[PDB]
Design a protein around this ligand. Structure first.
Ligand SMILES: [Mg+2]
Length: 314
């Protein structure tokens, strides 16, 4: 089983047909961040691709903004799928929300209305050939903006909601992968030199430090489980001033898994710097577990969107 995560900086902006791009990534589950697809655009070619069943979260606050999508081959059709981390935009859902007493409902709506998370749940056969659930949480984390101070708070609250949800699903049994653009690099090795000699003072990095365990947190950074000392392993370079060529970059795209999943089912986790078309490159994991496809796509699937019903229904 193979899974890819990629902040694609706009599906359309790659200027390649999406079927060709997805096939080239050669994976059973492909998670895209910053699709820049919103529902007002009626962008059927970006949402419905031959050979895949897909699950989008669309931003509700601005056209052509944010957005995440999970594309599944027939082999991995999910048993359940849900938009968001809190449940407010939710048959066929994932549940297991955790305790959100610290969040107002209106804050939950705000954290979930920007198209930043989609969850798909897959049955898998583990290394003892027992059936288990794997929940894939595909996230595009926000960014702080100095001219809008409230967005730093938004980002930290999004991280706290993500932790709450992921740990609650994990507590229900089975396995959890969190992948996507976390928009924080973890350790000095993850960023171009030189490094702060207060590096831990960053509140997003403090969050990551306690969320991840080291082979206290319940999740492992799979890339570093397999490549703990690899240098210059970046996933993001700014578009300007030749950064990708000079390796002026950072590693901010992750495939995180619960400890038991990474230790027992992962074979490798890598960076794909050869893949062009975005300001980020993909990351990819290779797993030994085998998926059990659902018999029907759950209701979140894009094929059920009324705007895409087709001419025969017209
Ligand atoms: Mg971008």
């Amino acid at each position: 089983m193979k899974i890819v995560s990629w902040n694609i900086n706009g599906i359309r902006a790659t200027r390649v047909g999406l079927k060709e791009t997805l096939d080239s990534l050669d994976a059973d589950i492909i998670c895209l961040q910053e699709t820049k697809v919103t529902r007002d655009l009626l962008d059927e070619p970006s949402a419905i691709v031959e050979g895949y069943n897909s699950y989008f979260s669309f931003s509700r606050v601005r056209s052509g903004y944010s957005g995440v999508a999970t594309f599944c081959k027939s082999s991995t059709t999910p048993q359940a799928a849900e938009e968001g981390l809190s449940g407010v935009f939710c048959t066929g859902s994932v549940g297991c929300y955790g305790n959100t007493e610290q969040f107002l409902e209106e804050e939950l709506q705000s954290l979930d209305q920007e198209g930043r998370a989609v969850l798909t749940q897959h049955r898998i056969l583990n290394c003892e050939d027992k059936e288990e659930t794997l929940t894939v949480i595909n996230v595009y984390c926000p960014r702080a903006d100095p001219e809008k101070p409230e967005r730093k708070t938004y980002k930290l609250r999004f991280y706290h909601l993500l932790q709450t949800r992921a740990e609650a699903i994990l507590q229900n049994g089975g396995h959890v992968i969190i992948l996507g653009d976390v928009n924080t690099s973890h350790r000095p090795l993850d960023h171009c030199d030189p490094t702060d000699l207060t590096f831990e003072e960053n509140p997003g990095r403090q969050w990551l430090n306690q969320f991840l365990g080291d082979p206290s947190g319940l999740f492992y950074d799979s890339f570093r489980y397999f490549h703990p000392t690899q240098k210059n392993a970046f996933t993001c370079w700014c578009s300007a001033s030749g950064a990708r060529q000079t390796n002026y970059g950072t590693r901010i795209d992750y495939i995180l898994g619960n400890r038991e999943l990474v230790e027992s089912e992962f074979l490798d986790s890598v960076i794909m710097p050869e893949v062009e078309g975005s300001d980020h490159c993909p990351v990819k994991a290779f797993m030994k577990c085998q998926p059990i496809a659902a018999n029907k796509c759950p209701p979140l699937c894009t094929k059920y969107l009324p705007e895409f019903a087709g001419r025969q229904q017209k």
